[PDB]
A paper describes a structure:
As in S. aureus and E. coli, BlaR1(WT) expressed in L. lactis undergoes spontaneous autocleavage between residues Ser283 and Phe284 (confirmed by Edman N-terminal sequencing), which was mitigated by mutation of Phe284 in the P1′ position to alanine (BlaR1(F284A)). The structures of BlaR1(WT) and BlaR1(F284A) (the latter alone and in complex with ampicillin) were determined using cryo-electron microscopy (cryo-EM) to nominal resolutions of 3.8–4.6 Å. The BlaR1(F284A) structure (refined with C2 symmetry) exhibited less variability and the sensor domains adopt a position slightly closer to the membrane compared with BlaR1(WT). In the BlaR1(WT) dataset, the sensor domains were observed to be dynamic and are able to adopt different orientations with respect to each other and the transmembrane domains. A comparison with BlaR1(F284A) shows that the sensor domains are positioned at different distances to the transmembrane domain in order of BlaR1(WT), BlaR1(F284A) and BlaR1(F284A)–ampicillin. In the BlaR1(F284A) mutant structures, the autocleavage loop is intact; however, in the BlaR1(WT) structure, we detected a mixture of uncleaved and cleaved forms, the latter with the central P1′ Phe284 slightly shifted in position. Although we observed the same binding orientation in the autocleavage-deficient BlaR1(F284A) structure, the P1′ alanine mutant leads to the loss of the close van der Waals-driven socketing of the aromatic phenylalanine side chain into the S1′ pocket, preventing productive coordination of the carbonyl oxygen to the zinc. The F284A mutation results in an unoccupied S1′ pocket and associated movement of Tyr261 on helix α8 towards His201 of the HEXXH motif in b (orange) and c (cyan; dashed line). The strain containing BlaR1(F284A) (blaR1(F284A)-blaI) displayed intermediate growth attenuation in presence of nafcillin compared with either wild-type BlaR1 (blaR1-blaI) or the functionally defective BlaR1 (null) (blaR1(null)-blaI), showing that the F284A mutant is partially functional.
BlaR1 and MecR1 are membrane proteins with an N-terminal zinc metalloprotease domain and a C-terminal extracellular β-lactam-binding sensor domain. β-Lactam binding to the extracellular BlaR1 sensor domain regulates BlaI cleavage by the zinc metalloprotease domain in the cytoplasm. BlaR1 forms a domain-swapped dimer, with the zinc metalloprotease active site accessible from the cytoplasm. BlaR1 undergoes spontaneous autocleavage in cis between Ser283 and Phe284 and we describe the catalytic mechanism and specificity underlying the self and BlaI cleavage.
Numbering used by the authors:
A (entry chain A), B (entry chain B): 1 to 57, 87 to 585
């Protein structure tokens, strides 16, 4: 239904706007106005979407189709509309009952009352399918429909019959009757319930009402002497100024037609209670409210700093590199570090400092955490398969840590997160400075989600993981290390891990991280591609090529 | 930014609502009111989200992470805000320039004018950091800030000085000055630009203004005799009734403070041009508008009929079945048909008639269409691989039609849709009654998307595809058929195809379709599971078991 309700709103607003446009033009240039019946077109326009006419002029293998969650939109849209119509229906009925009450309590007029009405309407031979009644229960005129078109006038106006107030009242309310405004109002009012999903129904009923009163004024002017026009306007003002103003009913017409500013102001004057409120009233409210604002300040807010990249300086000595030739077709950034010299070597430092979600490379942390916490071990580095198929054929099997890491088997790693107390992981994120340390709410929060780290930070953290972390065992450090070997020669053993930030089928994060153990030094590094085809494989190739050219993988 | 703008709106509305609540209570029960300065808290509340304080109390394998398209939300939210603030800034400046003009055009008062102001404010020793000016360019009082708090009074009120209008005007505007309302208004006004993303800024400036006028009224009552209270209210009305009403400025205070209904009505009376507009004006507009409504009727609308299942009768003779034992754990529906008898056999007909997207089973139509149209053939039943990895390991290869169909290789089939003129496909959807024949906009529209078909329709269409379709070659019919063989014995050859409606990792459509060629008859069928584990594999198992029990796969 949500789509239909929306389409209805669109249809409605289209027509509605066109009419507003015309309304403007007609008055602005010609002193012309719309015949309000035209507004029925907006209602009709919004009913169009609901008219059912096609009018115009073996091997079991499968993938996951990612559709929008419409159930959570249409189930609620349906309910929202239903509840509201019930509420509005009640409001309507309440108003209806009011009208019925008055109908029951309506009084008949005698010949010395009826003749005033006749005097007023007679000259234009207005129709007799109208009802005039009086009452002791009202302060100012009220119209009613009932197929009768009743004008109920407070009985006091049958005493105050020497100031022409009735002339204006009757012609005014009469005009509404003439044009069946009350009825039409009711019809629209009913439709405002039916079509309550579209707030413009209220907007238009209001505009209609405003204009209905205007047309009535036009009528009255047509029915009065030019030298009484001023009087009429004054009368209109008196009809509101001298009375209490309440929306006692939303169906009938009356002088007090809207929640105006004057309404509020004038009532306050009538209720001239010149009491100075205690200063403490607002001291309390203001501080209370302030504290409630504080409560809002106790809650989630954003920070430009969080959105930002490593804005921090590097505390270590470093050199800036130019490796743009190697990045070539896949622009990015790169960080290398020398353990012996405590020196960093950074390509495009501004970019090196940019934080990206780790993707699959985080799995080394996830797995090694499981190892230290005694969740995952060597004898039991393995995880059971749930027999659910996964994204690569390579993943549809049981596996140990070396296999799981080598083939990036997400299943293996999903279970590892589930099997490790989250607080263990959170503790390590904090202790070893894991980028923004943002664990999100996702068990695999690093997988193109909430946790982000720069290449510089990635190098710092891994290096410290082995070099400094005193809250992590030697076995976990080494067991993990062996699973990452890429290549080796007479100078070194190169270790690392790739991952691809692939989202909605496109590449966004070309990750490759690692370290090198050589026969002269130890190096740490991180590569990230953002442009071209920023895949994990390209990052691997790029990193190796760089490290070799820089002497890391070539003896210098 | 969208998230922040939203958070701001939320923060704002929270506080705002609390204040509205208090406002209600204070007046409703005590005749007390908020000190409008409190509304600064809503502005502050909406600024909170922007405060950057973390306050509270290798083998390359990868999968696709399906994230929400925030770029299309934040890029626009940013622009929307920027454009609007520019517009509002202009509007502000326009208002500012107006005020500057008046400042430049302000006139000084002489001693016989100044003494009136003094008479009015003197008794309460009101401060002199106020400016009184007069002008020939205005009709009613206007306030200005400039750090001066200027009250500009039309020069005519210095002639009409024997009716106490000034008493009320000055005290009223003075009160606004006393409380620095103009300034605060301006500040809020400036913030309504800054925080324009939140429409409540306008709501509150309005509420503030309304209440500012109220506080001024309270002040005035505090500063006048009780027997003048009535006069004051009348004066307020005169200050609007007897003047043109225009929002000449949105910063200054004036008598004509809002776009009221009375405003509109009274102007219309002043402009008492009693011209009957031609009837043709609205005949045109109404019909035009109608035709524009028709234009909306020329457009997309929904149909309950489209949303509905096969509401149609079956034109063929049939028997209703009870196979609930076999469905068992995976409730659904099932249709079988006898070619010799022209009879249908239907389990849960109400459910059999339900339409579901075909999933991978549609591929038989897609492929056979390619065959007839001479896009795909036998010698060239094959399709090249684009070297992109696909959802199953089974799919990461080149393939012919038999392999592609047997392993559901979506890639193969995606290319087939791309290689077949869409009109060929559309023609066949129409000619052979393919369910709702809805081709969507998706090249693979049948894959848990727009095309839907019932099991009954699935049986009818496939049967007719071979039995009746005279716009489709024999080779395409048979080539496709061979690729579907499941099993055979001394009575028959069973053919078919599965597919699984898996969405966001869950099973929704357990499809299996097919036919049986026996040594006595020919049968057609379609199975669909909706409950339990409605997988394509279960559908295959269920269908076979049913067909055998029914005699289809067992000689009867
Ligand atoms: Zn009226
Ligand atoms: Zn004022």
């Amino acid at each position: 239904m949500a789509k239909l309700l929306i389409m209805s709103i669109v249809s409605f607003c289209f027509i509605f706007l066109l009419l507003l446009f015309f309304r403007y033009i007609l008055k602005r240039y010609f002193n012309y106005m719309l015949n309000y019946k035209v507004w029925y077109l907006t209602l009709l326009a919004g009913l169009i979407p609901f008219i059912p006419i096609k009018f115009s002029l073996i091997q079991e293998f499968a993938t996951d189709i990612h559709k929008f969650n419409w159930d959570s939109i249409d189930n609620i849209c349906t309910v929202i509309w239903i509840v509201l119509v019930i509420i509005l229906s009640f409001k309507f009925l309440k108003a209806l009952l009011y009208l019925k009450y008055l109908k029951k309590q309506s009084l008949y007029l005698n010949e010395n009352e009826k003749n005033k009405i006749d005097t007023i309407l007679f000259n234009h031979q207005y129709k007799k399918n109208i009802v005039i009644r009086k009452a002791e229960t009202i302060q100012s005129p009220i119209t009613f429909w009932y197929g009768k078109y009743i004008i109920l006038i407070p009985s006091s106006y049958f005493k105050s019959v020497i100031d022409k107030r009735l002339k204006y009242i009757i012609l005014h309310e009469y005009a509404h009757a003439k044009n069946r405004d009350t009825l039409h109002l009711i019809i629209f009012n009913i439709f405002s319930i039916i079509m309550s999903y579209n707030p413009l129904v209220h907007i238009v009923k209001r505009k209609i009402i405003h204009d209905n009163e205007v047309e009535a004024d036009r009528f009255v002017l047509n029915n009065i002497n030019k030298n009484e026009f001023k009087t009429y306007a004054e009368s209109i003002m008196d009809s509101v100024l001298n009375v209490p103003f309440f929306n006692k009913n939303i169906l009938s017409h009356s002088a007090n037609g809207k929640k105006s500013l004057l309404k509020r102001r004038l009532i306050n004057i009538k209720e001239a209670n010149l009491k100075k409120q205690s200063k403490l009233i607002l001291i309390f409210i203001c501080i209370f409210t302030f504290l409630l604002m504080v409560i809002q300040s106790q809650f989630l807010m954003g920070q430009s700093i969080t959105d930002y990249n490593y804005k921090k300086p590097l505390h270590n000595d470093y050199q800036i590199l130019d490796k743009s030739k190697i990045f070539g077709s896949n622009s990015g950034s790169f960080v290398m570090y020398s353990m012996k010299k405590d020196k960093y070597y950074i390509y495009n430092e501004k970019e090196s400092r940019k934080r990206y979600s780790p993707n699959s490379t985080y799995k080394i942390y996830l797995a090694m955490f499981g190892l230290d916490r005694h969740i995952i071990n060597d004898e039991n580095s393995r995880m059971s398969w749930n027999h659910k198929h996964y994204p690569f054929d390579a993943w549809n099997k049981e596996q140990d840590l070396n296999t799981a890491m080598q083939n990036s088997v997400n299943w293996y790693f999903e279970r590892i997160s589930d099997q490790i107390p989250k607080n263990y992981t959170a503790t390590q994120l904090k202790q070893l400075n894991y980028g923004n340390k943002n664990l999100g709410s996702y068990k695999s929060y690093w997988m193109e989600d909430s946790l982000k780290i720069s290449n510089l930070e990635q190098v710092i953290v891994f290096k410290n993981m082995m070099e400094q972390n005193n809250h992590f065992s030697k076995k976990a450090k080494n067991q993990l290390s062996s699973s990452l070997l890429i290549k080796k020669n007479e100078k070194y053993e190169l270790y690392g891990k790739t991952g691809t930030g692939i989202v909605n089928g496109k590449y966004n994060n070309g990750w490759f991280v690692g370290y090198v153990i050589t026969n002269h030094d130890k190096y740490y590094f991180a590569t990230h591609l953002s442009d071209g085809k920023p895949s994990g494989k390209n990052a691997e190739l790029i990193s190796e090529k760089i490290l070799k050219e820089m002497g890391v993988l070539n003896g210098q």
